[PDB]
């Protein structure tokens, strides 16, 4: 009763307090407002289109000079509640990531300190278009930049001063959070003739990539490669499996094509760089080429691919004669070339196969640099 | 005729949230009924549906019988939603989605205090169709709905025919069919042990489906398939030597086709409901097709290999002839096709049996529930 009825009638929040009027002690420098950013969770990542759905605790602070109470308000309880419509609430806009209005971080219950200072901090399910670019894929995986602040007010109606991103990074993400710096600021611009709205700039530098696609995807390559590798070992052990060897090309071919087909599918869902996508398709082509090589190299050669005396001489004639045919073929066989073929298949597989993990490394060394 | 004064009189005392209950020990007389008009989504595997229900709402409140200036003026009045007792409807077992356009609509106040109202509602629900509803015998869809607010000691719902229909406006583009709709008006006491009964509205819907389109897509391929394998089976007796592998090419082709089927329609049942009986005949008549199929190669696998100076030399050459003959003889005792020919008739009648077992039984699982 300590003037309580009278006093909250004095404040009348809505009626006596100007909620449509922001208590910035009138036209001056600004109401000292401060924002605090704490991610509570990251539910979805879209690397390809630079869009992220993430939850944040919108911790907000500013002193409501008309909020200061007396005994039957202040001291009656040095802390009490008052809804959004009865509390000045900063119009915090997610500067480059609010291209998706904020949810339940809107007009929510706020905390009333005793001497005007107020505290409003609810949950924000939001969507953002963070600095992915086609450079959010090299190993550094860029730095996702975001700015928060009270949209409406300027530098003479609002001043917002300034937590790791992995503090509530989602563990079900296909990426890795390496760092998350936080520093506020204020800034005018060229077309504006005055300074204004201060903001929470929070850069998130992350990284991502599976250690799983590598598993089932290179797996078939050394397996498949041994087929093409054996392909050339097999032309020796038994090149006579002509048609059947041919079958395997169809078969290793259809395998190759849609394998690449699964590749862009996951690709579009992921902006993949040009550097990596080529080593994949470049090398399967390496075999594709050698499958075509397989073709020709496997089917490439033009062919390998006194009366009684009179009569039997006829046969010795037919004898020798087609013995020339028979041999016209082994002429083509080309067998002392055999090992060199599969030797100069080994050498190149070694060259290229190495060239890749050689390149793997020559770029694996400098990032680790 | 006091038209102005009357309106202004009751509105003075007019009470919103209070029920037109004479007193408190005998509840009010509430009438309800539903005419189906749209069965928008049948996801039986998850047991849920969406329907535009005519929520026929009716009750009594003479709290406003009028005089010459309103009752007599016109025995009919259309007064706004928010202006009289409103049953917040929902289906106990079904309504899984708050009603849409089922409320906030113009009600009807005759002149004696009779109240009539009927908004249309598209909403979600969950009726049976629990590992059954795909047979030929149908699981009766049982939906009971009532106000989810107060309980029958103040509120009382009424109904009508429990014998007469869901097919009243059952959708013609449904992959199913209805044969009866029974409905009972009842009290509240369930398995869960709730008392103070709030009456509800039971909605039986035993309906049929299965108007197969996929049937003959399944029936002709299998016959073509069976024949294809019976090609594999009889074609060998007709086919040349370069046919053993010929037959193989078919196995490869035969099952490429097979599991592709195994991938096709399995998808079918996941997006829609499911049931194992019809499922059993297919995969196992299918596994037997596969069985005797690979059996065939194991059959075209079985057999051992089918899978004076003058005369001294005339002597020995006449030998290569008899010698190799002994060899070609090998071929003989090996490829005298008793097993193969018979394998044709083996699968043949086995074919007839697998088929008869199945289509005869499909005859039954359509004929008992017929």
């Amino acid at each position: 009763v300590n003037e309580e009825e009278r006093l909250i009638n004095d404040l009348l929040i809505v009626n006596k307090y100007n909620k449509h009027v922001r208590p910035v002690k009138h036209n001056n420098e600004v109401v000292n407002i401060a924002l605090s950013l704490t991610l509570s969770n990251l539910i979805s990542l879209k690397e390809t289109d630079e869009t992220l759905t993430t939850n944040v605790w919108m911790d907000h602070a500013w002193y409501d000079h008309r909020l200061t109470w007396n005994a039957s308000e202040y001291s009656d309880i040095s802390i009490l509640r008052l809804r959004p419509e009865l509390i000045w609430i900063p119009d915090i806009v997610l500067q480059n990531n609010n291209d998706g209005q904020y949810n339940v971080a809107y007009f929510c219950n706020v905390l009333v300190r005793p001497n005007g200072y107020v505290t409003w901090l609810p949950p924000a399910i939001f969507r953002s278009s963070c600095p992915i670019n086609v450079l959010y894929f090299p190993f550094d995986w860029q730095n996702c930049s975001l700015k928060f602040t009270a949209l409406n007010y300027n530098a003479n109606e609002i001043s917002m001063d300034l937590i790791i991103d992995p503090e509530a990074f989602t563990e079900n993400g296909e990426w890795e959070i390496i760092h998350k710096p936080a520093k506020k600021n204020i800034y005018g611009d060229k077309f504006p003739n005055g300074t204004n709205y201060q903001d929470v700039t929070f850069y998130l530098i992350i990284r991502r990539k599976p250690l799983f696609y590598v598993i089932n995807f290179i797996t078939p390559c050394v397996l498949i490669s041994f087929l093409a590798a054996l392909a050339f070992y097999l032309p020796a052990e038994s090149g006579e499996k002509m048609s059947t060897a041919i079958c395997v090309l169809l078969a290793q071919a259809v395998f190759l094509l849609l394998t690449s087909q699964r590749l862009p599918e996951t690709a579009l869902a992921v902006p993949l760089i040009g550097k990596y996508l080529m080593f994949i398709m470049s090398l399967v082509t390496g075999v594709v080429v050698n499958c075509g090589i397989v073709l020709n190299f496997h089917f490439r050669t033009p062919s390998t691919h006194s009366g009684i005396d009179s009569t039997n001489y006829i046969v010795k004639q037919i004898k020798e004669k087609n013995a020339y045919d028979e041999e016209v073929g082994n002429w083509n066989l080309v067998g002392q070339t055999i090992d060199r073929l599969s030797m100069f298949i080994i050498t190149p597989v070694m060259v290229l196969g190495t060239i890749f993990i050689f390149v793997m490394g020559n770029f694996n060394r400098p990032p680790a640099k | 005729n006091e038209e102005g004064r009357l309106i202004e009189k009751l509105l003075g005392d007019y009470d919103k949230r209070i029920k037109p209950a004479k007193t408190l020990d005998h509840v009010i007389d509430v009438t309800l009924k539903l005419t189906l008009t749209n069965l928008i989504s049948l996801n039986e595997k998850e047991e849920a549906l969406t329907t535009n229900v005519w929520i026929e709402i009716q009750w009594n409140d003479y709290r406003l019988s009028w005089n010459t200036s309103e009752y007599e003026g016109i025995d009919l009045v259309r007064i706004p939603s928010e202006l009289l007792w409103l049953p917040d409807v929902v289906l106990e077992n079904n309504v899984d989605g708050q009603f849409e356009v089922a409320y906030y609509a113009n009600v009807l106040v005759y002149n004696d205090g009779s109240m009539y109202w009927l908004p249309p509602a598209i909403y979600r629900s969950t009726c049976p169709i629990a590992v059954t509803y795909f047979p030929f015998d149908w699981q009766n869809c049982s939906l009971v709905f009532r106000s989810q607010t107060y309980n029958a000691h103040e509120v009382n719902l009424q109904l009508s025919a429990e014998e007469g229909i869901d097919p009243e406006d059952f959708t013609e583009n449904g992959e199913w069919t209805i044969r009866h709709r029974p409905a009972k008006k009842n009290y509240n006491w369930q398995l869960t042990k709730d008392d103070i009964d709030f009456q509800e509205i039971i909605f039986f819907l035993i309906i049929q489906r299965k108007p197969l389109f996929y049937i003959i897509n399944i029936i002709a391929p299998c016959v073509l398939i069976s024949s294809l394998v019976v090609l594999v089976y009889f074609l060998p007796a007709q086919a040349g030597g370069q046919k053993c592998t010929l037959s193989i090419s078919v196995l490869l082709a035969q099952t490429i086709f097979l599991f592709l089927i195994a991938q096709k329609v399995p998808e079918t049942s996941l997006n829609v409901p499911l049931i194992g009986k019809y499922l059993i005949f297919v995969m196992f008549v299918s596994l037997v097709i596969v069985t005797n199929c690979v059996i065939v190669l194991n059959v075209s696998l079985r057999t051992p290999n089918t899978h004076s100076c003058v005369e001294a030399c005339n002597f020995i050459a006449k030998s290569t002839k008899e010698q190799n003959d002994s060899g070609s003889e090998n071929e003989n005792w090996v490829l005298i096709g008793k097993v193969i020919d018979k394998a044709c008739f083996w699968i043949a009648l086995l074919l007839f049996s697998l088929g008869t077992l199945a289509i005869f039984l499909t005859g039954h699982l359509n004929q008992v529930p017929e």
Partner: protein, 370 residues
Amino acid sequence: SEHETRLVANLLENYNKVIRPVEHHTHFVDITVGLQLIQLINVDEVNQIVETNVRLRQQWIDVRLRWNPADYGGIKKIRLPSDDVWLPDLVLYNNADGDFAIVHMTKLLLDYTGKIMWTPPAIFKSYCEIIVTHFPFDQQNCTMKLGIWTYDGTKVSISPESDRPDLSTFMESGEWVMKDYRGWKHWVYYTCCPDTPYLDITYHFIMQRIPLYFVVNVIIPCLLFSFLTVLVFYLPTDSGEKMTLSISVLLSLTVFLLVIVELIPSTSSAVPLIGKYMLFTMIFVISSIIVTVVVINTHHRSPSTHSAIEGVKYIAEHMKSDEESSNAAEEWKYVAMVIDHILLCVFMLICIIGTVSVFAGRLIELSQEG
């Protein structure tokens, strides 16, 4: 000035928005509908759903809105916002799948006399017949009824306004094409009740479907397959050396036909085409089936094909001769005389089936094209 404030305030005070301009017990509130689809955004024949542009021309009179020199004298006709107006609960009968979009908080015009128009720029969600009879070449007429939703011909009546085509603003991006559309009025009294019920505008959409791209891709792999099967006929009679070689094709091609089946039924499921369309493919595709199985079983149909010194010479020559015999036997197996028969046997068959497939194709194309 001119009773300025007295003008404006008086008007607010004695005027109840919710009141319906009822005039004695008779004519009901005469209100007319007039829909002009400016354009259509998207449709799904399968799910029979359309999102369309509609400017609803709504007319009615409120003799309470008539004025003198202090309202009409101010400025003849003027702009008054909706709110204050009694909005007919307009509803597409067997349609209505969605709320009117941009019907709310718009404005209307009042004349020096009273007459009011409410014509807010709508676009909404629709629901009209398509049945499995819409994608036909012979189309179906989308039956769409419109009229007053919760008020009767005694409280109110929705009437029509004029004739106009549906292809007047038909979407050129539609996978369908229009024939004509007409709309005539009607009053629905039900044998139920002896009362005189609501009025209604009935739309009839007569349009035939199928964009032509589909046309080309599908019939050409058929004449494609026609040639391989054509080769399936000519390859054997002109060369039985690659019978098995074709074994391959038979596998590669029915599977081609199998996979084309996934693609076009989803088309089937993507767009509702009258099933009688399906039988085209049915026998057509399936003859590829019955013909093969016979053609290739027949292809397959053949047993195995798919002094003393002088005497020495004659026991040896005799050996070469009866195997001589043998060779001719298996060739007496794969003859080239009837493979020619099957060639013309079926090619006439194909030119029959084919021209028979072209038959009903051509025939109702003699009806559709008209």
